[PDB]
Design a protein around this ligand. Structure first.
Ligand SMILES: Fc1cc(NC2=NCC3(CCOCC3)CO2)cc(F)c1Oc1ccnc2[nH]cc(C3(C(F)(F)F)CC3)c12
Length: 268
C-alpha cells in the first residue's frame, strides 16, 4: 500500500526539520510523525523502489524508527515515520560535547538491539554513525532508515553495484567507530582525505583505530572498541554476541542517561 491520498488529508504539517544530508523533512500530527518528501522527476518510476519498500514496513522493532507508509500524491513521494524530537546524536553532541562512557554504553546497547533485529530479517543497515542514530524526547534510541548506466555491466559487476559481497558484521565495525565518534566528536582519521583512508584501511598492515585518551575510559570500553573493530569479518562478533559484552550488559543503562544529555542540550 503506497497510498495516493495527499499527506495533508491524514496529517497537519507542524515545522520543517530538514536540510544538510537529511533533505526535506516535516514535523506533523495525526500522534507526532516525521514526513520526508522526495521530488519525483521525469524518468523516475516509484515501482523500482517496490523491493526496498517491503524491507521497511515489515522491519518492526522499538530501536528501529517505525515506517507508517508512503504517498505519491502530486510529483512527490512522502515517507511518514516515527517522530524523534531530538534529531541525531550528531545534532546533540555538536551542542553538548562528548558523551559520557555510560551514555555511549546505553546508546551502543540500544543500537545493538536494533542491529540484532535487522540482522534477524537479513537486513544490513550499512550506515551506522551519529547522524543516523535518532533520539526522542523520552531519551529513547532509534536507528534511522535513510537512502553511470548499468547497460554495459556484466551481471557479476551489477550484483556488487547493488550488494557488496560483505555481510551484516560491517554494522558491528561501524558501531565501534560510532562509539569513538560519540566520545571524541569525530570518527578516527576525520582530518585525512577520504581516498587516502580507503587506501590505508585496504592495507593488510592496517591497525584498527583506538580511543585517543586511554585514562579517560574503563577497560570494558577499550575492549568493546577492540572487539567491534576486529579487522577480519570472520572473527568479528555478531550483534547478539556483542549484547553480552560487559559495557552494554552492565545494569544502570536506561533512558535517564539520555534525558540528562537532553537537559544539557537545552541548558548548555
Ligand atoms: F534525524 C534528523 C536530523 C536532522 N538534523 C539536521 N541537522 C542540521 C540541519 C542543517 C542546519 O539547519 C538545521 C538542521 C539539518 O538537519 C533533520 C532531520 F530531518 C532528521 O530527520 C528526522 C527528524 C525527526 N524524526 C525523524 N524520524 C525519521 C527521520 C528521518 C527522516 F527524516 F529521513 F525521515 C531521518 C530518518 C526523522
Amino acid at each position: 500500500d503506497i497510498f495516493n491520498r495527499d499527506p495533508r488529508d491524514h496529517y497537519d504539517l507542524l515545522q520543517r526539520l530538514g536540510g544538510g544530508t537529511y533533505g526535506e523533512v516535516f514535523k506533523a500530527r495525526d500522534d507526532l510523525v516525521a514526513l520526508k518528501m522526495v521530488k519525483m522527476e521525469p524518468d523516475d518510476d516509484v515501482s523500482t523502489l517496490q523491493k526496498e519498500i517491503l524491507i521497511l514496513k515489515t522491519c518492526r522493532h522499538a530501536n528501529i524508527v517505525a515506517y507508517h507508509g508512503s504517498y505519491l500524491w502530486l510529483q512527490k513521494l512522502w515517507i511518514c515515520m516515527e517522530f524523534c524530537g531530538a534529531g541525531s546524536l550528531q545534532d546533540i553532541y555538536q551542542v553538548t560535547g562528548s558523551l559520557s562512557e555510560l551514555q555511549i554504553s546505553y546508546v551502543c546497547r540500544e543500537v545493538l538491539q536494533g542491529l540484532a533485529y535487522l540482522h534477524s530479517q537479513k537486513k544490513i543497515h550499512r550506515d551506522i554513525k551519529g547522524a543516523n542514530i535518532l533520539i526522542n524526547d523520552a531519551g529513547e534510541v532509534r536507528l534511522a532508515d535513510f537512502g553511470g548506466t548499468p547497460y554495459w555491466m556484466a551481471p557479476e559487476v551489477a550484483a556488487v553495484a547493488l550488494k557488496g559481497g560483505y555481510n551484516e558484521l560491517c554494522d558491528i565495525w561501524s558501531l565501534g567507530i560510532t562509539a569513538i565518534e560519540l566520545a571524541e566528536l569525530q570518527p578516527p582519521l576525520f582530518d585525512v582525505h577520504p581516498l587516502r583512508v580507503l587506501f590505508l584501511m585496504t592495507k593488510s598492515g592496517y591497525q584498527p583505530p583506538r580511543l585517543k585518551e586511554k585514562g579517560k575510559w574503563s577497560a570494558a570500553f577499550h575492549n568493546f572498541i577492540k572487539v567491534t573493530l576486529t579487522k577480519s569479518p570472520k572473527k568479528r562478533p555478531s550483534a547478539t554476541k556483542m549484547l553480552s559484552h560487559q559495557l552494554v550488559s552492565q545494569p544502570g543503562l536506561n533512558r535517564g542517561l539520555i534525558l540528562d544529555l537532553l537537559d544539557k542540550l537545552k541548558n548548555p
